Amino acid sequence: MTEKLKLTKRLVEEYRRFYQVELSKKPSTHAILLPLSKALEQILSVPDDWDEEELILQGSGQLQAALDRQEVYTRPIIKDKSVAYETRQLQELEAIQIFMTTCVRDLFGEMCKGDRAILQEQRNRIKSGAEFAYRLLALEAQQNQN
Amino acid sequence: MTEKLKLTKRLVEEYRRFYQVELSKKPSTHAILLPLSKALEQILSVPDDWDEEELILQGSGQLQAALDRQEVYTRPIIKDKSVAYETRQLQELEAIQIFMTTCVRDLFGEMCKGDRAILQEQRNRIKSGAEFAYRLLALEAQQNQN
Amino acid sequence: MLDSLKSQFQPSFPRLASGHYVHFLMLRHSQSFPVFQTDGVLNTTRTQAGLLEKTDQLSRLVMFKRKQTTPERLAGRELLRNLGLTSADKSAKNLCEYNGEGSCKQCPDCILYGFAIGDSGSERSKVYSDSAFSLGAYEQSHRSFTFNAPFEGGTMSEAGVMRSAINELDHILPEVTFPTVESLRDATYEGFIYVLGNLLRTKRYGAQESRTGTMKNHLVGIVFADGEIFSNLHLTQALYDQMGGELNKPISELCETAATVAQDLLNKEPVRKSELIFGAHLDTLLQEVNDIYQNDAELTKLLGSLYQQTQDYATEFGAL
Amino acid sequence: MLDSLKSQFQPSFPRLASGHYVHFLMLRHSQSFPVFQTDGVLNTTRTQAGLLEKTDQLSRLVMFKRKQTTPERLAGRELLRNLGLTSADKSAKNLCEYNGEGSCKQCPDCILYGFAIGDSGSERSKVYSDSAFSLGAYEQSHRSFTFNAPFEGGTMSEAGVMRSAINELDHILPEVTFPTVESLRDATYEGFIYVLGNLLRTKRYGAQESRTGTMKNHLVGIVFADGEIFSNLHLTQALYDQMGGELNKPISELCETAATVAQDLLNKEPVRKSELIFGAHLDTLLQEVNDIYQNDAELTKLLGSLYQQTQDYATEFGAL
Amino acid sequence: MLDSLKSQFQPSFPRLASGHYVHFLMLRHSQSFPVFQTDGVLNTTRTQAGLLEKTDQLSRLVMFKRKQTTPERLAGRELLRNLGLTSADKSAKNLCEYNGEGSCKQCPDCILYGFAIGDSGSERSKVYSDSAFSLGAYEQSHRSFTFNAPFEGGTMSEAGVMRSAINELDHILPEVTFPTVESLRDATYEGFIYVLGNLLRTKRYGAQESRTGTMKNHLVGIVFADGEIFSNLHLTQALYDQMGGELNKPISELCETAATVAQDLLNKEPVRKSELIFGAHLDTLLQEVNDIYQNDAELTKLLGSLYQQTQDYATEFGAL
Amino acid sequence: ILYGFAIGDSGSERSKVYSDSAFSLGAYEQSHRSFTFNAPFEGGTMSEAGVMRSAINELDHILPEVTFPTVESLRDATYEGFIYVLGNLLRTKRYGAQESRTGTMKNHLV
RNA sequence: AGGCAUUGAAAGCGACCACCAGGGGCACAACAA
Secondary structure (H helix, E strand, O other), rough: OOOOOHHHHHHHHHHHHHOOOOOOOOOOOHOOOOHHHHHHHHHHHHOOOHHHHHHHHHHHHHHHHHHOOOOOHOOOOOOOOOOOOOHHHHHHHHHHHHHHHHHHHHOOOOOOOOOHHHHHHHHHHHHHHHHHHHHHHHHHHHHHHH | HHHHHHOOOOHHHHHOOOOOOHHHHHHOOOOOOOOOHHHHHHHOOOOOOHHHHHHHHHHHHHHHHOOOOHHHOOHHHHHHOOOHHHHHHHHHHHHHHHHHHHHHHHHHHHOOOOOHHHHHHEEEEEEEHHHHHHHHHHHHHHHHHO | OEEEEEEEEOOOOOOOOOOOOOEEEEEEOOOOOOOOOOOOOOEEEEOOOOOOOOEEEEEEEEHHHHHOOOOHHHHHHHHHOOOOEEOOOOOOOEEEEOOOOOOOOOOOOHHOOOOOOOOOOOOOEEEOOOEEOOOOHHHHEEEEEEOOOOOOOOEEEEEOOOOOOOEEEEEEEEOOOOEEEEEEEOHHHHHHHHHHHHHHHEEOOOOOOOOOOEEEEEEEEEEOOOOOOOOOHHHHHHHHHHHHOOOOOOHHHHHHHHHHHHHHHOOOOOOOOOEOOOOOOHHHHHHHHHHHHOOOOHHHHHHHHHHHHHHHHHHHHOOO | OOOHOOOOOOOOOOOOOOOOOEEEEEEEEEEEEEEOEEEOOEEEEEEEOOOOOOEEEEEEEEEOHHHHHHHHHHHHHHHHHHHHOHHHHHOOOOEEEOOOOOOOOOOHHHHOEOOOOOOOOOOOOOEEEEOOEEEOHHHHHHHEEEEOEOOOOOOOOOOOOOOOOOOEEEOOOOEEEEEEEEEEEEOOOOOOHHHHHHOOOOOOOOOOOOOEEEEOOOOOOOOEOOOOOHHHHHHHHHHHHOOOOOOOOOOHHHHHHHHHHHHHOOOOOOOOOEEEEEEHHHHHHHHHHHHOOOOOHEEEEEEEEHHHHHHHHHHHHOOO | OOOHHHHOOOOOOOOOOHHHHEEEEEEEEEEEOOOOOOOOOEEEEEEOOOOOOOOOOOEEEEEEOOOHHHHHHHHHHHHHHHHOOOOOOOEEEEEEEEEEEEEEEOOHHHOOOOOOOOOOOOOOOOOOOOEEEEEHHHHHHHHEEEEEEEEOEEEEOOOOOEOEEHHHHHHHEOOEEEEEEEEOOOOHHHHHHHHHHHHOOOOOOOOOOOOOOOEEEEEEEEEEOOOOOOHHHHHHHHHHHHHHHOOOOOHHHHHHHHHHHHHHOOOOOOOEEEEEEOOOHHHHHHHHHHHOOOOHHHHHHHHHHHHHHHHHHHHHHOOO | OOOOOOOOOOOEEEEEEEEEOOOOOHHHHHOOOEEEEEEEEOEEEOOOOOEEOOEEEEEEEEEOOOOOOOOEEEEOHHHHHHHHHHHHHHHOOOOOOOOOHHHHHOOOEE
């Protein structure tokens, strides 16, 4: 199947589903690509003998335990007052596990061939494309809402 | 799957058999990880100048002593069944001892290389994996019928 | 001593070098818990423990390449600014941005330690380092310390929520020793007093300077030679070999063993060695260099001269 | 030892080469973090692991071609300048610009390592060299280090805004070995001591020489021969197969394994071999070459003779 | 082995051809980054990938027409000068200037590889050679590297003026294979040993021999025939088809496959095949030839005899 | 501006005031004791309502008359910056853990 | 000297930066007989 290429927009929309900042706040690159920076840091930092399925629970837990280190203004699931908080959390933990499995299989495993040296040389380039893709998606929402 | 997926699962399913905060209380990270925190703390707080089998028997007694301070609704192996004191106490002791066999002979001894330095730089990540895995299991066990 | 050595150096910086190396051979003893890190862990590498005996593997800490040149270098720039030979104000004609397009082309820092971006080309360093290694094993030379950062209320809660400013950090212990060689190519006598001055006068290394990383650089030898001598790793392996794998011995004894190993190794290098300053000749040389750096008139004369020597280099051979 | 070998060399450089190769078989061990790069990444290539038993594909680092001749030349040229045989000053009668139009056409570097630009023609190098490969696989032999460059204020934001002074680079680890066979075609005895001089006396390789990339060249044999012996890749693969791929062994054991594979490879070459200098005969050869390079009167006698021989070549057969 | 092969050959060179081809089947493996260029790019051409099955077009590298005969020829001439059968000094009765008048017109190079400059006619090469093709596609088989040439002061600016010396060159990767048949017409037995000697004793091929282009020639068969067997492109396309393009196989499995595709093709050629030296008979014959080329008495006798044969030919039928 | 800061989009500034870790002049075995501490139920006993709540452990505390020689430093200051920094050194007294109960010290400037 | 009782909650980082300039052919040989 095709998933050996063309990943980057789905990778960003899959975290934009649970974490956001508006470009009207004039945010840092560090505040835009925050979820992907935690995911790539976890993949590259933990010992290289560990394989895919242990990384996902660790990297998701590194990202749930780091978005709860920030303001509910940035969480467009936990901020929906229409829903009971345990069911906000059931949605939150399935968004993070679905993003972070795309970061461990699709990004690291397929797009970077599962090699930490290939991932490391092109980390800054991957990140850059996610910052631009985030802005591109932010400029879609104001189009569909008007 | 086995070589780290079963290790990273059983690391929490072996404490869920003897320790459970029910998640609707919205409990702390410190309250969920109470077995693994005191197991990894007991493993780092002594050097490898004496053996893993001495470490299990001293550590299992310490973990069973900390859960003698817990309220009984947190110990499912005493709360969730009605059977004689000496037999429910023996199964609770063998669940505590077997959890401490994986924690020393697989998590510390193989996955952390048997080396305190690579475990110590990794505690926050193996804690965040175990944190995430506990909620991923507990909220699945609660909500999979919905 | 220095009155004899003036003869060994060049009269002005040359266009290309000529094999007039001077090597400073030193032990850098840790005090006050240093941090040498790059990716959030202390830097370590697997190595052979010794040379002939003690062939077994040992992981040792590494003071990675730049972390030992740039503390020296910046302590030099500050002295050039105390003496008024270079400046920090953007209105001044002798301004020197450290790292930028904005750099001077002509101060002692730029011509000795080198520069790279700009339109006026670039200049390779005349002072040469390499990464330096702990004489001991990493397991017996580090400890990790928890740190916290609470609210001024003396608590980790301000609204009854927890502040989450907790982590632990890996620190190198005191009395850990990194054996090092820095080497200098085709300098003048005043340039030698500038870089030697930096080795002696700079004390703080690595991360978090404001709180840790004070070090005792004991200079062990100064060797004038026709080429470069042994690596830092080869000196650490030779010194662990000679110390018998029992490094847990006094700091003066470790310095005298290093003087004895350095001279043993120098006899095996295919370089002419004009002058070898060890023992009482080094203790006397250091004391009269320590005298230069304590007398305001001599230090201002010597470093004023280096400035000119380097403005001349810049205008004759450098970035004009 | 060397008193016997003068019989095997040519008495002066010949117009065309008549098959008098001297080969230097050596292990280049990393000491501290070299950077062997082109196009902004460590050069690495896929190869068979070893010749016959270990037949899996294996990515290994490549010390690409010039990166192990250029340090040899530039250390030699500096010695020609210390000895005053050549000069750096643009007025002088014995000037040699490197790698430029104003190159000398008659000094020992020019005849032994060659030149090409300008009207007087070109000369091919008498020193022959090859790309060298890491004995181990790339994944166990490199590490990536991040680096930053703060403003001298000790911050990344002195201007009130972040510097953009942060990126990462890949460096080869210590104890990584690159097997190599340099060759010298039709030299004099004095040319042999000059080229062997460089191999034993040069220490720095790759990018960032001023900060990194010290290496320890262990010469494991010298072989006088009627032709060219094995490629670097073939020696690398033969030594990996001889080590059974368990490369985590002491450097001294790797050097005797290198000697004892190299002799078995030499037995399979359609080349007459006149003097295979290995082991205890190489130790006494290298100790005799050291006591040339350690002695002022002996080195200046010997390399001056090379100058004349090379001048004579230039004015009889070369560039005139 | 060679003691039986002596029968197949003719006793002296004839004036007109008489059949009697010997075909040297080779795989040439790259070992270290060859450059095979004309006009500043790697020579490359579009061809069908393989004969019957994988009939898609594919671009492959071309080891062009001379690049696989001048290395052989010049290495044999060096041997003729080492053995003293020819000389390179002017005012000697056995001179052989390459590519001029004053080519010897009597030595084994002049007779086997031909001459055509000046008075006294021209001689057709008895060694017949061809352009060879990479078994793999150009995209899997090359890389571009950048080359710099900084000033000797260690940077790409010399007075703040930049140095215009950065280009890139394309080089063929290691372990890429070039299938070949080179062919010898009307040789004597010593002439066969000379030509075979050149094929086993040569090691460098491309541009920049001084730094690059070591190769490993595996002779995979020797076939005695009345005339020319399949083309070089045809062996390459047959070998590619036999693997289906699964070319990432170790070099022994690749040489053993080449021996079997070569025997399949020989059975479809309208040529009487007197002798087919393959496998255990070939790795005995190669050993018996290594025993000649490692022995001064055998080699001086054998090529001295060729000299007479080629000189006899010169005075009876050739230029004398 | 004197002791430094780092979180924010506004920048960071390194401390002008420099410290080491300080070390005890005497050895550890001559300069500490470990003290038991217990936390009863305020009815005055370890029985909470019929069964003991456990709250006794020991903690290790440095003795009085133990000296930590130290050298602080301040760079590129103004005179009023020195009056602030020397002031803080002279005026503050509560150093360690458990400020509310212990770790009063006297800094003697020598 | 006894019974007893060796802890307990929480927190597990946070911000920003992921480069910068300048070089990108230089010399000659285009047939020899």
